[PDB]
Amino acid sequence: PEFLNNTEPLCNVSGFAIVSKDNGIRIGSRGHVFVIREPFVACGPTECRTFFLTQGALLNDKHSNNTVKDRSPYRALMSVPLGSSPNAYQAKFESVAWSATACHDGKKWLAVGISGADDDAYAVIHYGGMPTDVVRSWRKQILRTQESSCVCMNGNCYWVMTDGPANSQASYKIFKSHEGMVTNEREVSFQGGHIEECSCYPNLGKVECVCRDNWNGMNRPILIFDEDLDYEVGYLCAGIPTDTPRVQDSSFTGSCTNAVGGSGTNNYGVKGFGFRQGNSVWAGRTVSISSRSGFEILLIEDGWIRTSKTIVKKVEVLNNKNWSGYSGAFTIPITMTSKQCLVPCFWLEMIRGKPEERTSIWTSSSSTVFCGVSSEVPGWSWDDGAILPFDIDK
Amino acid sequence: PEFLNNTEPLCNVSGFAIVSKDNGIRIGSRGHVFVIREPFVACGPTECRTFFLTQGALLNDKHSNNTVKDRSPYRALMSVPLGSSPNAYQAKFESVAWSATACHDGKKWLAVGISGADDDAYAVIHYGGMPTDVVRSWRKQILRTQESSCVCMNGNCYWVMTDGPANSQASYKIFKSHEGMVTNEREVSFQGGHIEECSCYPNLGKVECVCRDNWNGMNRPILIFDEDLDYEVGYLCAGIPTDTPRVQDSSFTGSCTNAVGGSGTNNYGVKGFGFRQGNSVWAGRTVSISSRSGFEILLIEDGWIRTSKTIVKKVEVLNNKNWSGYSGAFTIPITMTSKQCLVPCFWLEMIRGKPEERTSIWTSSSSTVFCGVSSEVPGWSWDDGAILPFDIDK
Amino acid sequence: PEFLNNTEPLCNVSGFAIVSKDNGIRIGSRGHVFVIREPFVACGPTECRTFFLTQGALLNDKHSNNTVKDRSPYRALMSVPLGSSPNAYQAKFESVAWSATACHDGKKWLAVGISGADDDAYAVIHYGGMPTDVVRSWRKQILRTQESSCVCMNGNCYWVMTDGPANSQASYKIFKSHEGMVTNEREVSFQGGHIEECSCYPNLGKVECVCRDNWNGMNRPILIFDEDLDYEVGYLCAGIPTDTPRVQDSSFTGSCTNAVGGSGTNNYGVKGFGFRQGNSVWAGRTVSISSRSGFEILLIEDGWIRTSKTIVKKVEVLNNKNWSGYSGAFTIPITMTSKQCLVPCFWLEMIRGKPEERTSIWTSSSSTVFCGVSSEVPGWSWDDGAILPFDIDK
Amino acid sequence: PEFLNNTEPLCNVSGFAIVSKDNGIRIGSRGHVFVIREPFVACGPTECRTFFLTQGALLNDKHSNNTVKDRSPYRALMSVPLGSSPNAYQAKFESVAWSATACHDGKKWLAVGISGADDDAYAVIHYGGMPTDVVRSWRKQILRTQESSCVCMNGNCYWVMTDGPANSQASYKIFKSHEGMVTNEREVSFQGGHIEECSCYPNLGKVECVCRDNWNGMNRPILIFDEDLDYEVGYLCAGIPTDTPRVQDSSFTGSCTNAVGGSGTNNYGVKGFGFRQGNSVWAGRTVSISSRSGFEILLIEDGWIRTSKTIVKKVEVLNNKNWSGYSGAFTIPITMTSKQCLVPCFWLEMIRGKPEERTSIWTSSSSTVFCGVSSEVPGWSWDDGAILPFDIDK
Ligand SMILES: CC(=O)N[C@H]1[C@H]([C@H](O)[C@H](O)CO)O[C@@](OC[C@H]2O[C@@H](O)[C@H](O)[C@@H](O)[C@H]2O)(C(=O)O)C[C@@H]1O
Ligand SMILES: CC(=O)N[C@H]1[C@H]([C@H](O)[C@H](O)CO)O[C@@](OC[C@H]2O[C@@H](O)[C@H](O)[C@@H](O)[C@H]2O)(C(=O)O)C[C@@H]1O
Ligand SMILES: CC(=O)N[C@H]1[C@H]([C@H](O)[C@H](O)CO)O[C@@](OC[C@H]2O[C@@H](O)[C@H](O)[C@@H](O)[C@H]2O)(C(=O)O)C[C@@H]1O
Ligand SMILES: CC(=O)N[C@H]1[C@H]([C@H](O)[C@H](O)CO)O[C@@](OC[C@H]2O[C@@H](O)[C@H](O)[C@@H](O)[C@H]2O)(C(=O)O)C[C@@H]1O
Ligand SMILES: CC(=O)N[C@H]1[C@H]([C@H](O)[C@H](O)CO)O[C@@](O)(C(=O)O)C[C@@H]1O
Ligand SMILES: CC(=O)N[C@H]1[C@H]([C@H](O)[C@H](O)CO)O[C@@](O)(C(=O)O)C[C@@H]1O
Ligand SMILES: CC(=O)N[C@H]1[C@H]([C@H](O)[C@H](O)CO)O[C@@](O)(C(=O)O)C[C@@H]1O
C-alpha cells in the first residue's frame, strides 16, 4: 500500500451522470435505518463510502423525536458502502461527532469528528480506526468543520475548520496532517468574510474549496491553498449567486473580493460546491432562491475569474417540487479510473421532516451522487421519494 | 488477477439440476427484503451473485404500493450472494437503474444501469464500483437492456440494448466495452423483427443470444455475434413456439427468418432463454400459452437449424398452478469448474402480486436457479411459496 | 491452500466442554431468525460453521405454520459462523435441500443437498459454491443423507446415503468424492439392519460412523470404511442402548451383530453419535427412554468391542425437564489445534414446538456444541430457553 | 503474523478524548440489539473490538424479562467492531459465558468464558475461535474473572480469576497461557483482602491491575506481576477512595497495605480502573459516593506510592444526573499507533433498567470509550440517552 499522489489536474467535464441513490428514508419506513443528516462521500483506493452523522436513533422510533436539533452527545460519524442505506447493521462506526470530515490517504481512512459542549468542543482525529490526535476549540464557540470529504495529497491530508459566531466575524483555520497527526495549521485572514462547511477537492497539487458564508454573503467564499498552507481567499467571481437564500440572478452583481448580500439573504446559507474548469466553473445550487428546494448545476463561462453571467450549461437533478439540502464535492483517484486526471463528483442531500414538513416529529435525509463525464448528460428528478408522515408521527 | 478467456465451447447437457432458491417473498413476510423484479444471475471467478432491480422499498411496507410500475427514480440495481434473499442488509448497491445488465470480466464486476426520463434515458457503466462511461438514448424512447448477465471474453464485455417503440419497429444495438469504456457499437438490421431483453451466453468465442419479440413474433429472435460485432440475426428455427403469449404447438409453423405471430399473440412477450446444443436447442417456456404460469425446459432435436417439432426431453421445474415470469441464461466459467467447456445455467423469476393477484397492492418476485449437468435430472415444482395477501394488503 | 490429511488418530478425551450456544429461538422471538431443524457443525481449516435446514420461513411469521413437516420445496441448507443464530442476514446459502451433509476438504467447502419429490429425489453436490455433480435416487423412496458433517481425508470426501422404506429393509450406500465429483460408490450389505442419519468422523485414516436404525434396533448401527469403501457393518456392542425410544438398561442385552428391539421401541429412532476410544466408546443419548427429552453422554468401558454395561463416566448437558433432539459428531482438524490427534466434538439439537408442544403452530430448534478435552468436565443444563407460545401462536 | 511484544512503557497522558459511543439502548428501542452487561474493549494488531455478555435475548422482547440476573445458561460472550451496537446481526460469537475476559496476542484472539453451575463452574479457553483448554473451579463458589481485556506479552496472555465468597475471604489466582493453553498459574496470598474484576494493562513488561474489593475495602486492590507470575499485592495508596460505595474524600485516610472500609461501604463495590503514571495515578470513579451514577477521572499526584490527596486534574465524562456502571482499562498496541509507548484507554458502562429504574422489567447497558492523549481535553456528559420505559415495559 502506498500514499495516493492526488496531484493530477481535475478533469474537464461536460456533464454529470448519476452514480448512486440510497433511498434510505423510503427503506427506513420499515427497515432499520439511522436518522441522519450531513451525508457525504469520500473515496479510497478501492472503494467509495457514504459517511453520515447519525442522531443515535432509528427512523420510525420514538428516539427520532426532536432530531431537527444539530448537536447532541448521541450523534456519531459512521459510514456504509456507496449506495447503501445508512442502516443499523452495515454502518461502520468512525467517530463520536456532531460535525465531521473524512478522507483516505491511500493507506488508511482518516476521520475527524467534533463533539463536546458548544463552548469547549474538540475534534478527535482517527487514523485507520485508531485515535491519533486532538484539536481543541480555540474560540470556544462551536468548533465545526466541512461535513464533506477532506483532501489527501502525497500522504498529507488537509481540512478547514471554523470557530466563532454563526452570523458575524469568526475564525477560520486550515489544517495539515500526516498519519493522523496534525503537522501544520494556518489561520486564514478574511475580514468581512465568513467561511463554513467547505467543499474541497484536489486540483493540480492545490486544494480548492468552495464554502458557505453564513453572514453577509449570498455568493460563496473560495479558498485555495498549497502544501505550505499558503492560501488565497475571496469569493466566487461569477455574477450568478449560488448560496441559499439569495436573490434572482438579474438582481445580483458579482464580486471576486467582497461578500454580496442584503435583500433578506443575510445570516443564513447552505453547504454547497463548485469545480474550477480552467477559467470557468461548475456550480451547484437549489432551484428555489429562498428555501432548500430543487437542485441544479450550472457551467458558468469564465465564472472562476470574472463576474460573468454567461451560463453555458444547466442541468437539473431535482425539480423544485422536492426538498434538497446540503451538497458537496469529492474526487475519484487515478487508482480506480486509470485516468490522467481526477474525476469531479458531487453528492446531494435531500432533507425530509422538520422544519419544512411540520407534521413530522423528526428530521433525516437521503442522498444522490453524481460524477462528471466527458459528454453532456440529460437531467431528471431523483427525489427522496418517502411518503410522509410516518407511523411514528401518528 | 487475469481476464477470463471464456472462449471455450458450451457444454452439452442432458439435464438441469436446481442450484439455488432464495425464498425472498416468504422471508419478506417478516424480514426486511426489497420489493424487486427482473432478477438475474452472473458469475465471477470465485462466486455467483444474484442481481435484481429494487423498487427502493421493502415488502410489507406502504412504499411497496403501486410497484407493478416498471420505471421510477427509486429503482436500483443491487446484488447479493447466490441464494440469499434480496434483503436490506446484505444488498450491495451496483447502479441507479430501471433496466440493467451485469457481468464479470475476470478482474472486476461490470454493471450497466439505465435511468432517467422515458424520452431521455441514459446508461451509466460501472466498473469495479466506479462510474466509467455513459451511453445515451439514441431514439429517445425508453432505452433498455437485457435484464440478465452480459458476456465477457478476453477482457471485453458485450451486451445488447434497444431503443424505440414497444409494439413496432425499434432500434437494436450491440455494445463492446473494455474496463468499463465502450470501445465499439453496431446497429443490428432487423426489419420486421423486434428484439428486447436478450439472454446471451458465450459459445466457442461467439456471443449467442435468445431474445424477446414484443411485436409480431411468438417465436424468439436469435442474435449471434463475434468480437468485431459482426452478427447474424433471425429467429429460433424450432417449430415449437417458446414466447408467451403463443399458440398451441400444433397450430404453429416455425421459421428461421420471419416473426410468426397472430392469433392474439401480438404485442406482448416475456423474457426467455435458449442454449444451442450443436444443431439442437434447450429452450425454456411457461407452461401456459397465455400467461406467465408454470415453467418447463425442452430439448428440441435440430431446433437451432430447422423447423423441427421433435421434443427429445422435457423437464418441468414449476407446475402450471404457480406463477412464473422472466427467465435468463448465464454460464459458469472454467475457473470454478476446472472443466474444458462452459456450463449453461438458467434462472427463473416467479412473480407475485399484481396484475395476476389483484388483492395485493404490490408486485415482487423470487427466483430459482438451475445448472446443466451431463445426465438426466428429474423435475419437480419449486414455487415461490408465499401466502398472499400480506399484512400491508389488509 | 492444501488438502487436509485428516488421517491422525482420534484424541482420547475424558470430558466434554461447552463451546457454543446459539440461543436462536430466544433471539427469534423478536429478531429475524429462520425456522430450522437438523442443525449440524462442520469445521474448515480456519473456522467452524453451523449448518442447518431452513423451512424457508422466519420465526414468529405466518409462513412458520405447519413446519413440523419434514420435506418441502422451500427448505434450504444454509450456514452461519459457529455460535450465531440462524438469522436472515448472516445466513450463507449452500444448497436447496430437505436433507443434507457438508464438510471442508482443506481447500473448499463441499455441500450435498437433496431435494425433489419423494419418489424421484436427487442430491446436488456443491463444491466451493459451484454445482459439480448429481446423485439420483436409486430406490425412488426418499433419498436421504446424514444431517451432519461428512468426512474428508487427503482430498477425498465421504458420506452415507439411504434410499427405501423408513420402517423396513432399505438400501444403504457409501459415496466418495474428489473436488465435488463422485469417484466411487459402494452399496452396504446389511440384511435385517437399518441405517439412517449417520454421524461419522475420521479415526486413523478410516471413517467411523454411528447411525440410526429406524426399524428393529434400539441399538445403533456402526459402519466403518476405508478409502476403497471396503467396510465393516454391525451394531454398537455396548449392553447399553442409546437410541430413542429404547428400554431401561437393565432390560437390555447388547449385540455386536444384530438389531435388538421390541418392547414398543420398533419403527422409530433419533439421530445420535458415538466416538470410539480404543476399545471403549463415548455415546450420547436422551435422558428419557421414550421421548426426545434431556441429554447425557456416557463413557462405556470396552463398549466398542463387547456387550459391556460398565459406565465409567456420565455427564449430563441437558436435564430431563427440557426438550432435546438430534445429535451429531464432528472433529477439529490439526490446522486449528496444532495437535497430533483429531479432537472429537458433538452438537445437540433442542427442538421446540410440535409435536411435543401442541399449542405452537411451528417447529424449530436451537443448538449447543461441545468438544472433548483431556480432563473431566462438570455438566450442567444448557436448555433452549425460549418461552412458548410465541406471538404467532396467539 | 507475529506476536505482539507489548513490553513498552505505558504512555504518560494529560487528558482523555472520547473515541467511541455505541448508543446501543437507544438503537435497540427499534433495532435488534442484544440485552447485555459487562461490556469491555480489547485491541488486536489491526482493530479494536467491543466484547459483551449477552442475556441471550433482545431489547424490547419478552425474553428480556428478569435480565437483572447475573448468571444463566443463555449468557454468551460476543463481540462487535468498536462503536457498533451489540446487535443481532453483527455480533460475533466468542464463548458461552456469564463471566469473561479476552485479548489478542498478535496472531489470534483469545477468549476465556466461564459457564456452568455456581458450585461447579468452568472456564473454556478459545484461541482463534477453537476450544483449546479448560480451567475448573477450585473452590466451587462462582469461579469468575475480569470482565475486561486480558494482557498479552511476547506471545503469552495473562488474566486473573477469583473463586469463593463475595463478601469474605476468597481465593485469587493469576493465569498464564500460550496459544490458548494454560502454562502457569499462581495463587495470590492476600489475607484480609478481596480481589474481583481486575482491570489490567501492560506497563514496561509487567502486568498492572486495579481491582474491586467486595469485602472490607472502599479502596481498590492493586496487583502487579511479571512473566513468572511473581507478584506484589496491596491497595491503591491514594488518600482518595475510588470504589463505590465509599465515603467523602475528607472522611477517608488512604493505605497502601490494608482495606479501608466501614461507614456502610462494606460488602459491595463496582469494577473500576486506574493507570500508573510514574508515581502518580489516573483513577476513575462514579461521581456519586453511594450509587453507580456519574463518572469522572482523577489524576492524583504520587497516588500510586503514597496516601496523597492532591488532585492535579479532574475530568467528568458523565454527569451525576445519569447512570454509570463498570469501567475498565485496555491499551492500544504499537502496531496501530507507531509510537514508542502503549496508549492507555478506558471504557465506561452505562446501566439502564433494574434496579435503579424499577418501572423496567429488564437491565442492559451501553458504553463510551476514551483514550489518553498528550494534552488536556475538556469533559462533557455523554450519557446513554435512552428514554425509558420501553414498549415491553408497558
Ligand atoms: C418543495 C417545495 O414545495 N418547494 C416550493 C417552495 C417551498 O414551498 C417554500 O420555499 C418553503 O418556504 O416554494 C416556492 O415558491 C416560491 C414562492 O412561494 C409563494 O407562495 C410566495 O408568495 C413567493 O414569495 C415565493 O416564495 C419556491 O420556489 O421556493 C416554490 C417551490 O416549489
Ligand atoms: C397460476 C395459475 O392459476 N395458472 C392458471 C392460468 C391463469 O389462471 C390464467 O392464465 C390467468 O389469466 O389459467 C390457465 O387455464 C387456461 C384456461 O383458463 C380457462 O378459464 C379459459 O377458459 C381458457 O381459455 C384458458 O385460458 C392457463 O393454463 O394459463 C390455467 C393455469 O393453471
Ligand atoms: C421435557 C419433558 O417434559 N420431559 C418429560 C417427558 C415428556 O413429558 C414425555 O416423555 C413426552 O411424551 O416425560 C417423562 O416422564 C416419563 C413418564 O411419564 C409418565 O407420565 C408416564 O406415566 C410414564 O410411563 C413415563 O412415560 C420422560 O422421562 O420422558 C419425563 C420427562 O421429564
Ligand atoms: C442518576 C441519579 O439520579 N443520580 C442521583 C443519585 C441516585 O438517585 C441515588 O444515588 C440512587 O440511590 O442520588 C444522589 O443524591 C444523593 C443524596 O440523595 C438524597 O436523596 C439522600 O437524602 C442523600 O443521603 C444522598 O443519597 C447521588 O448523588 O447519588 C444524587 C444523584 O444525582
Ligand atoms: C455544527 C453545526 O451545528 N452545524 C450546523 C450548521 C450551522 O448551524 C451553521 O453552519 C451556522 O454555523 O448548519 C445547519 O444548522 C444547517 O444550516 O442546516 C446544520 C449543521 O448541523
Ligand atoms: C424498461 C422496461 O420498462 N422494461 C419492462 C419491459 C417492457 O415493458 C417490455 O419489454 C416492452 O418494451 O417488460 C415488462 O413490462 C414486462 O413485460 O413485465 C417489465 C420490464 O420492466
Ligand atoms: C428426509 C427426512 O424426511 N428426514 C426426516 C427423518 C425421517 O423421517 C426418518 O429418518 C425416517 O426415515 O427423521 C425425522 O422425521 C425425525 O425423526 O425427526 C426428521 C427428518 O427430517
Ligand SMILES: CC(=O)N[C@H]1[C@H]([C@H](O)[C@H](O)CO)O[C@@](O)(C(=O)O)C[C@@H]1O
Ligand atoms: C460472576 C458474577 O456474578 N458477576 C457479577 C458480580 C458479582 O456479583 C460481584 O463481583 C460479587 O462477586 O458483580 C455484579 O453482580 C455487579 O456488581 O453488578 C455483576 C456481575 O455479573
Ligand SMILES: *[C@@H]1O[C@H](CO)[C@@H](O)[C@H](O)[C@H]1NC(C)=O
Ligand atoms: C415528541 O416530543 C414532544 C414534545 O415533548 C411530545 O409531545 C411527543 O409526544 C413526542 N413524540 C413521541 C412519539 O415521542
Ligand SMILES: *[C@@H]1O[C@H](CO)[C@@H](O)[C@H](O)[C@H]1NC(C)=O
Ligand atoms: C481543462 O480546460 C482548461 C481550459 O481549456 C485547460 O487549460 C486544461 O488543460 C484542461 N484540463 C484538463 C485536465 O484537460
Ligand SMILES: *[C@@H]1O[C@H](CO)[C@@H](O)[C@H](O)[C@H]1NC(C)=O
Ligand atoms: C395504495 O394506493 C392506493 C391508491 O392511492 C391507496 O388507496 C391505498 O391506500 C394505498 N395503500 C397503502 C397501504 O398505502
Ligand SMILES: *[C@@H]1O[C@H](CO)[C@@H](O)[C@H](O)[C@H]1NC(C)=O
Ligand atoms: C456438443 O454436441 C455437438 C453435437 O454432437 C458436438 O458437435 C460438440 O462437439 C459438442 N460440444 C461439446 C462441448 O462437447
Ligand SMILES: *[C@@H]1O[C@H](CO)[C@@H](O)[C@H](O)[C@H]1NC(C)=O
Ligand atoms: C396455521 O394453519 C392452520 C390450518 O390451516 C390455520 O387454521 C391457522 O390459522 C394457521 N395459523 C396461522 C397464524 O397462519
Ligand SMILES: *[C@@H]1O[C@H](CO)[C@@H](O)[C@H](O)[C@H]1NC(C)=O
Ligand atoms: C487412545 O487410547 C487407546 C487405548 O489405551 C490407545 O490404544 C490409543 O493409542 C489412544 N489414542 C491416542 C490418540 O492417544
Ligand SMILES: *[C@@H]1O[C@H](CO)[C@@H](O)[C@H](O)[C@H]1NC(C)=O
Ligand atoms: C416479567 O416477569 C413477571 C414475573 O413473572 C411477569 O409478571 C411479567 O408479565 C413479565 N413481563 C413480560 C412482558 O413477560
Ligand SMILES: *[C@@H]1O[C@H](CO)[C@@H](O)[C@H](O)[C@H]1NC(C)=O
Ligand atoms: C512517565 O512519567 C514518569 C515520571 O516523570 C517518567 O519516569 C517516565 O519515563 C514517563 N514515561 C514515559 C513513557 O514517558
Ligand SMILES: [Ca+2]
Ligand atoms: Ca449566505
Ligand SMILES: [Ca+2]
Ligand atoms: Ca411476442
Ligand SMILES: [Ca+2]
Ligand atoms: Ca430405533
Ligand SMILES: [Ca+2]
Ligand atoms: Ca468495596
